[PDB]
Amino acid sequence: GDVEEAIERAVVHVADTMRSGPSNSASVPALTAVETGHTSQVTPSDTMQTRHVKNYHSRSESTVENFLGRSACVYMEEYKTTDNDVNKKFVAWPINTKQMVQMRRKLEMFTYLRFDMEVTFVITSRQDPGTTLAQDMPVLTHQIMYVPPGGPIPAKVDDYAWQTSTNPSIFWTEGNAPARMSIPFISIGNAYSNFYDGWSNFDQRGSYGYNTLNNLGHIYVRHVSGSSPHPITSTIRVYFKPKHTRAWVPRPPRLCQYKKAFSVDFTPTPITDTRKDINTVTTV
Amino acid sequence: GDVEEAIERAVVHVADTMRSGPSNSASVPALTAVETGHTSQVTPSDTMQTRHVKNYHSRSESTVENFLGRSACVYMEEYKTTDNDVNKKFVAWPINTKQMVQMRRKLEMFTYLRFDMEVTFVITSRQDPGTTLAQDMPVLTHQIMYVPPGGPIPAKVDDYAWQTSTNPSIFWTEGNAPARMSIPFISIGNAYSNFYDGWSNFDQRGSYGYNTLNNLGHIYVRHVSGSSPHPITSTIRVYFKPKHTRAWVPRPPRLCQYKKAFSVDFTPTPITDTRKDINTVTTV
Amino acid sequence: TTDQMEMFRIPVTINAPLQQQVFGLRLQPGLDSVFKHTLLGEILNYYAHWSGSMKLTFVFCGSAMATGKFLIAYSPPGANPPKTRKDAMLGTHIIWDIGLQSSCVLCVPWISQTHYRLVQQDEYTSAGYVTCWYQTGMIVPPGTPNSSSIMCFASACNDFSVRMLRDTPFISQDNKLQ
Amino acid sequence: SDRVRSITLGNSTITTQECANVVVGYGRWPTYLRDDEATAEDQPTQPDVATCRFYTLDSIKWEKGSVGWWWKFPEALSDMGLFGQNMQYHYLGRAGYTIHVQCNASKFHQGCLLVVCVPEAEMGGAVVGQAFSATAMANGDKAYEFTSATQSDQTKVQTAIHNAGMGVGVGNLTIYPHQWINLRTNNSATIVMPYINSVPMDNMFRHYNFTLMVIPFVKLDYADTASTYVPITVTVAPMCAEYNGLRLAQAQ
Amino acid sequence: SDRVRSITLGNSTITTQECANVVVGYGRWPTYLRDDEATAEDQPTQPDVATCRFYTLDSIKWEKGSVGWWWKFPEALSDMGLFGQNMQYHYLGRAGYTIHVQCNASKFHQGCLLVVCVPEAEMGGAVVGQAFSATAMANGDKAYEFTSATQSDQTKVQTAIHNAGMGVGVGNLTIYPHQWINLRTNNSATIVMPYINSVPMDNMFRHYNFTLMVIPFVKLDYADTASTYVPITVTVAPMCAEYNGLRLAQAQ
Amino acid sequence: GAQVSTQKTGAHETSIIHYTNINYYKDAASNSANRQDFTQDPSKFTEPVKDVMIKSLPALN
Amino acid sequence: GAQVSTQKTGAHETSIIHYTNINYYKDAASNSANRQDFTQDPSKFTEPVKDVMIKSLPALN
Ligand SMILES: Cc1cc(CCCCCCCOc2ccc(C3=NCCO3)cc2)on1
Ligand SMILES: Cc1cc(CCCCCCCOc2ccc(C3=NCCO3)cc2)on1
Ligand SMILES: Cc1cc(CCCCCCCOc2ccc(C3=NCCO3)cc2)on1
Ligand SMILES: Cc1cc(CCCCCCCOc2ccc(C3=NCCO3)cc2)on1
Ligand SMILES: *C(=O)CCCCCCCCCCCCC
Ligand SMILES: *C(=O)CCCCCCCCCCCCC
Known part of the structure; x- marks a missing residue:
């Protein structure tokens, strides 16, 4: 009514270590068949004598909500206050999350994602x-x-499209707290796809890959009536922070460096770095 | 539910003075054995006639929470808006509390400390x-x-690392209230160590001293897209204010002036200043 | 290394000198090249602290006709790594016998002075070494290959956790893509 | 199956995929000294996990012409970690042991070993009447070997295998705790020896409580396989080790 | 009287006919690590009587011109019997101690020593900025000495007594557990130090948990007695020693 | 209708540690993050085998 | 769930002197300081002697 009790007074921890003594049995925990596609559930007490340890460590900072929930720069561009070139005076960006390497690698650790989005400029x-x-x-x-x-796209800083009778716009003045707003889960599907192994045409032709599912629209930005005697250059940086997140079917992290914004394309990169021999364990 | 009664209506005072009259006994309070490592619990009423005094004085301002709980400048550096030297345009600071003398002396009055930290810039x-x-x-x-x-460290003002998809960053605009945030107790140990009488290597070699336990990371700061025609110099000052503090095993305050940021090193300094003779009690 | 896939194959052969070492690796799951790019190492690289036990599963991939016993050990940190099977056997170990059950699990326990170690591990935060030796030898009957491969898998146990979110050193760019 | 076996003592675990059973002393499991069986009055140390764990001795090669080997206890373990250290600092000691003898071959190899523990394995000299030194029978974890021919070297023990160095019939060693490793069925042998002596505790350097003997009763044989020798490895774990009479360490 | 005191740990007993009290840490008696304060998961060894007993270090001479000495722990005990052995074989260790400093003179001698235990006694170099080696502060049970003059030798620690090698006022060392041996009343000092550190256990070679300092605040003086120097002896007993992470012994 | 729940533990030992929240917007998308849901199941990935396998018993046959 | 507690006394004689607080963040690290805990014990330092010593009686023997 007034106050509500959504208190989470009982939070989850990491497993305790049970005391374990000597054994001599036919029961053998350490031998398994990796072939089954099963990862062993063994713990130290299964293969050695352990003391009891009341473990208070918690996996709170590694929830997907927490891992993805920090604002990351996904784009940046410049637009001038005054210039002879019409296009140098406003930005037109096709919304996507594939141009800035850090955010991209994180999202791409999951195949499907569903979340609301906080955008800060x-x-x-x-x-x-x-x-x-x-x-x-x-x-x-x-x-x-x-x-x-x-929707109608602006061709210049002073065109009719900027009326925004229906499209959402933000008017922001310098010197103030950065602009921000939330967007709900807007996909036409049940989850956003980070990858798409397929084509646009039924023919198995046309575009190939995730880019065929990207149609989130554009972001357009201009100075309001800012023509100055001598040019001033503004730089806009857009940050995305997913919230109320759900993720499905996790994938190996990207190993090769990214080459293209709209394709998986890469250059073969070795598994890892090398050492002199299989027994080398020193540094020098 | 709505209101809660955490009221501290009963606060602690300093001890009252009890009235005390003449005595003639075998019981002798003023004679002791300092050799036991015991500090005498004597009070005026033990050695002279006292009147009763209801003492309302309180030790509120001398709790460790209060003594340590004021913001102190722990670092300052300059970074230019425009310069030919790449390094003159951003700051890279290895977080520590040993470079500014005042804060250092206070923390160093205790061997171990555990607290949350409020940081103001x-x-x-x-x-x-x-x-x-x-x-x-x-x-x-x-x-x-x-x-x-x-984590990846920035090599210049315009490098990819500044994307902060995961590291925490603060974007702040001049003319506004100073930036601030809280950091919890982040040590890998159970308490922060102000001193460490030991080595990094098991060999009893390598680094010696507290510096071997300092691995809190760095703070990096730059202008966002602030290149100006004529250079502007910004100076950042970082303040630390410990809160929710606990302190263990107190030590004598530092007598010798500090010489190094990462070592106890000093130059012998006399116990105190002198006077002409053991009976001199005047000023001139 | 000529062929990349060879990195996953630990060599084991017939008539190996008694007590010979099969391999040796240092326990820095987030820093050492052997682990840094595995699932576990990749996750660790988005954090600065880690704690918990690990499972190193070894699977023998030779023919059903080959036999062998190996001693796999874990040595908590100290000034010097084990150079001999005699040195290694004083630490935490398991003696693996090959039979129907092809895989064996060495579970390296969390033995540390601090509750957490750094992903960017240093000497203070040292974790030790894992080494493998021939306990007896790989014996073979007539008509079977002379050498075989062993594979190693790694994963975290239920007492494992990470702390302090941070960006990974494994990905970068000089320009916006496109 | 029962062939599968797992044993954990301290920080070490032993596993076997093809075993027989586990022989236990004379049906007696190792146990700490009781108050009603003690003489030495000082409070003993029972290091527990630090000493009661598996120690693997140097391996040996079983070749077609091998004849047999022996190791004397506790001498064989005198250099093994804290077990050896505790032996040195104490006048008296007491312990039982889990002995695990390992030997794998293949379904095409044949051979059979007797694995026995002989309590008080007092031996005769190579030349009757001639005394020999401790070095003729034990020295750390060094394996000593029997011979087919009768021994001539007076500095040695009478090593002729058929009399097992004791003047008895080698085929009668079966009255002592034992197990057989028949290559056709086994791959290891496990014997748990309890403490056996005529006194409650004893000095661990001066008295060899028992001797482990591994003797090929049926020779190692095989066909055109690239493998030549078959290694034999001995891993042993002290059990219920306790010591009394602490003082300075014995130099050797 | 209360001056009489008897302490028994393991196979050793200490007695004193003229003592003060017994100072106990910060009112904290030594104790084994609890399950809710542990991180290292392996079962620890608690050697008990073998390690928790009295060890007497080499003695030293207190002369009229002596200035002070220090010993770093656990380093000072690294060669003492099984305590030292256990330190070598284990990655982690933990212990408290009973420190008993002995010094007898006569009713005609005068002098006064401060006996303190300084936790984390991190020291400065003789020349600022110049690193020194472990050997400049500890080496087995060797007593290190302070000096009146300021130290010039860069291979040494800044030994000038009035700053106690730490850059603080020597007369303020009393905030650490201490006792005074005033020849006129005492003959010994006993301080029980509990385990104090920012982590539950630690490596015993790499970290000197605390330093024992014995400093003459009032010089040794006497008249026409035939006795010249007055010996000072330190006897210490580890308490509740437990170790984790067994492996091969550290060479030194 | 304010919601009151527990905070994540700080440097000091735990009652004073609860915070209160009130939603100001008409769309749930506007709400703050779900920083405190710790439900977790590693078995879809660590053990997707049809027939359950107890650790003590052997894996094959 | 607001907490209401007493203030530190001012220039005037003391009821009107209580303040109210509400936590706005999910982490206890975000909370204000514990300016008002006055628990205190000087005996770990002033008297760490095994055997307790009453002032009236002599120190030695
Ligand atoms: C960012 C980003 C990632 C991708 C993959 C796109 C995943 C988006 C999931 C669904 C989003 O909503 C849609 C909007 C339009 C379309 C569309 N498909 C054909 C062209 O437009 C489909 C889904 O490419 N860029
Ligand atoms: C494709 C795809 C899906 C994703 C996440 C991308 C979806 C991000 C949500 C789209 C957000 O787009 C905006 C909507 C409106 C505004 C805006 N409204 C007020 C002015 O600016 C800005 C961004 O990953 N791959
Ligand atoms: C400030 C300051 C004070 C010090 C001493 C450091 C005390 C810190 C206590 C623990 C903080 O968390 C840790 C982070 C990393 C490491 C580390 N040790 C080896 C190198 O990195 C250890 C503890 O030096 N600078
Ligand atoms: C070592 C040691 C320990 C101490 C106290 C030092 C610890 C101080 C806490 C570390 C704080 O570091 C920061 C963390 C993050 C940010 C930051 N986050 C948002 C942008 O800036 C700034 C400081 O004394 N000796
Ligand atoms: C929930 O509203 C039930 C109790 C009402 C609490 C009063 C709200 C305090 C002022 C904030 C109003 C929010 C309006 C955007
Ligand atoms: C505690 O919340 C119980 C009583 C509710 C009091 C209303 C809160 C007044 C407005 C502040 C809301 C705080 C939201 C950050």
């Missing part, structure tokens, strides 16, 4: 170097607009 | 002097990233 501006820099420009305001697939 | 910027200073630079934003031991 970090926008900074700097005056371009030049011969004459004296000016007195008022504070800048930026507009970030999300255009769902199929 | 004070960042200020100034335009470097020069022949031509006219410019109009927008507000600056800084990034402070914590790199736990073993």
Whole structure:
């Protein structure tokens, strides 16, 4: 009514070590058949004498919610306040999570993912170097607009599309706390796919790979009415923080360095690094 | 449920003075044997006639929580907005509490300490002097990233490591309240050690001293996209305030001035200052 | 190494000198090249602290007709690693006999002065060595290959946990992709 | 099956996929000295896991012409970790043992060993009347060997195998705790020896309580296999070790 | 009287006819590691009487011009019987100690010693910035000595007595467990140190848990007596010693 | 309707350690993270075998 | 679940002097300091002697 008792007063720990003494039996825990595709459930008490240890360690920091739940930079680009080239004055980004290596490797440890998304923007501006820099420009305001697939796309900073009568936009002024908002799980499927071993056409032709399922739309950003006498360059950095996460069918982590944003493509890389012989255990 | 009664309506005071009259007995409180390693529990009433005094004085301000619980500057460094030298543009600090003398002396009054830590950052910027200073630079934003031991370290302001997909970072804009956050007790041991009379190698070789137990990681800080036409120098000051503190085995305070950040090393200093003779009690 | 797949094959042969060493490795699951890229090592590399026991399962892949006994041991840290089977047998070990059950599990216990060790392991946080020796020898009847391979699997036990989330040293970039 | 066996003492475990049973002393499991059987009055040390664990001695080669070997206890273990250390610092000691003799071959090899533990295996000299030194019968974990021919070297013990160095019939050694390793069925032998002596405790250097003998009754034989020798390894674990009369360590 | 005192650990007993009290750690009596405070999972050895007994180090001479001495633990006991042996074979160890410092003179002698146990007595080098080796602070039961003059030898620790090698005031060492031997009243000092560390167990070679310092605050003096020096002897007994992580012995 | 639950333990021994939360938005997507769910099952991965296998007994036959 | 406790006395004579607190974070490390715990024991340091010594009676014999 007023207060509610969702208290988790009983939290999970790591397994205790049971005291274990000598044995002489036909029962043999240490011998198994790896061939079954089974990982052994052996513990020290099975193969040696152990003392009792009340273990209070907890796996709290390794839940998928926690592992994925930190904001990571997924994109960055610059847009000028004034320039002769129309395209240098605004950013148009096709939303995806494959261009920044760190976030990509983490998400890619799972095949399917389902989560809500917290998006934070970090926008900074700097005056371009030049011969004459004296000016007195008022504070800048930026507009970030999300255009769902199929909506009208802006062709220049001053076009009608920026009216956002229906698309969601954020107007933010410099000097303030970074802009932020939440987006729910928006896939047309039941989970987001990090990989897709298939084609776009029924023919088994067309696009191949996860890129065929990426149609989340674009993010467009411009200065509001910020034309300055001497150019100023703003850089926008977008951060993603998944929350209320669920993950399915885990995969080996990416070993080879990434080469392309929209394909699994790689260059063969060795299993691991080498040492002189199979018995080398020293450093020098 | 709604309200809770953690009220400390009964707080501790300093001992009262009991009235005490004349005596003539075989019982002798003032004579003892310092040799036992015992400090006498004598009070004025044991050796003279006292009146009764209801003492309301309290030792509240001298609890270890209170003594250690004030923010203290533990480090400061400068980083430029623009410079030819890559390293002059960002700070890389190996976290420790031995470089600033005041905090060091306080912590070092105890051998072991266990506490949570409140960290506050004070960042200020100034335009470097020069022949031509006219410019109009927008507000600056800084990034402070914590790199736990073993994580990728940034080699320049613009490198991939600054993505922080997993390391914790703070993005802060000038003109605002100083950045701050709490860190829990993160030692791999049961308490932090201020001293360590030992070696790193089992051999009794390698590093000697507390420095062998210091592996808390680094703090890296840079301007976000702050390249300015004329250089600006930012200075970061980091403050530590221990909270929820516990301290064990107290030691004599440091008498000799400190000489090194990572060693106990000192130059012999006399016990105290002198006076002309053992009876001198005047000032002039 | 000529062929990459050879890295997974531990060589074992007939008429090996008595008490010969089969292999030796140092226990730094997150740092040593032998473990750093395994499932366990990859997970460890997103953290800075670790604690718990480990399972090293060995599977004999020779013919059903070959026989052999091996001594597999774990030596808690000390100034010097074991150089001889006599040295090794003083520590935690198991004597593996080959038969119908092809695999054997050496469970290396958590023996440490601290509750947690660093993933970026150092001397203070040293964990020791795991070594393998011929207990008897690999004997073979007529008409079977002269040498065979042994494989090693690794995983964490139920008392294992990691702490302090951090970025991994194993992935990087100089440019945005595209 | 029962052929499967697992034994854990201290920080060591032994496993066998093809065994017979486990022979236990004279049906007597090792046990600590009781108050009603003691003479030495000082509180004893019982190091437990530090001493009661498996120690593997140096291996040996069983070849077609091998004749037999012996090891005397506790001497054979005098250099083994804390067991040896405790032997050195104490005047008196007492212990039982789990003896595990290992020997694997193949389904195409043949051979058969007797694995026996002879209590008080007092031996005769190579030349009657001539005294020999301790070195003629024991020295750390060094395996001593019997011979087919009768021994001539007076510095040695009478090693002729058929009399087992004791003047008795070698085929009658079966009255002592034993097991057979017949290559056709076994791959190891396990004998648990309890403490057997005429006094409650004894000095561990001066008295060899029992001798382990491994004797090929049926010679090692095989056909065109690339394997030549078949190794034999002895692993033993002290049990219920306790010591009395602490003082300075005995130099050797 | 209470001056009379008798202490028995293992096969050794200490007696004193003129003592003060017995100082006990920070009011904490030595005790074995509990299950809820342990990390290392293997079953430990607790040798008991074999290790928990009194060991007497080499004696030293207190002369009119002596300035002070120190011994680092457990290093000082690394060669003492089975205590030293157990230190060598194990990666981890844990123990408390009963320290008994002996010093008898006569009713006509005068002098006063501070007997302190300093936990984590990390020391500074003779020349700041210059590293020294383990040998500059400990080596078996060898007593190390402080000096009046400030140390110049860079291979040494800064031995100037008034700063106790730690950069603090020597007269403030009293916050650590201590007792005074004032020749006029005492003849010995007994301090029981519990295990104090930031981790449950630790390696015994690599870490000196505490340092015993014996410092003459009032110089030894006497008249026309034929006795010249007054010996000082240190006898110490480990208490509740337990070890984990058995493996091969550390060479040194 | 405020929810009150326990905090993750700090440097000090544990009652004063509970925090309170109130949701301010109409969409659950707006809510903070589920930092405190510790349900866990490693057997889909460590033992996906049809017939259950007890450690003491041998694996084959 | 708000906690209500007493304040440290001010210039004026003492009921109106209690303050209220509510924790907003999921980690106890985030909580404010324990400025008000006054438990205290000087005897580990002032008298670590095995046998207790009453002031009135002599120290030796
Ligand atoms: C980021 C990222 C990862 C990928 C794979 C895409 C996974 C997205 C899962 C479903 C998201 O919602 C959809 C929106 C549009 C489409 C679509 N498929 C054909 C082209 O557009 C499908 C799903 O590529 N970039
Ligand atoms: C494909 C795919 C799926 C994923 C995760 C990507 C999905 C991320 C959610 C999409 C978020 O897109 C935004 C929506 C709106 C706004 C925005 N609204 C107000 C102004 O900006 C910004 C981002 O991994 N692979
Ligand atoms: C600050 C400061 C004080 C010190 C002493 C260090 C005390 C820290 C206590 C434990 C902190 O957590 C650890 C992290 C890493 C290591 C480590 N030891 C070997 C190298 O890294 C040990 C403890 O030196 N600098
Ligand atoms: C060693 C030692 C231990 C001590 C106290 C030092 C420990 C201090 C705690 C370590 C704090 O380190 C930080 C962690 C993270 C951040 C940070 N996170 C968000 C961005 O900055 C900053 C400091 O005394 N000696
Ligand atoms: C839940 O609302 C039941 C109890 C009401 C508590 C009062 C709320 C305190 C003020 C915050 C209101 C939130 C409005 C966005
Ligand atoms: C504790 O919560 C029980 C009583 C609820 C009091 C209402 C809280 C007042 C508004 C603060 C909410 C805190 C959300 C961060």
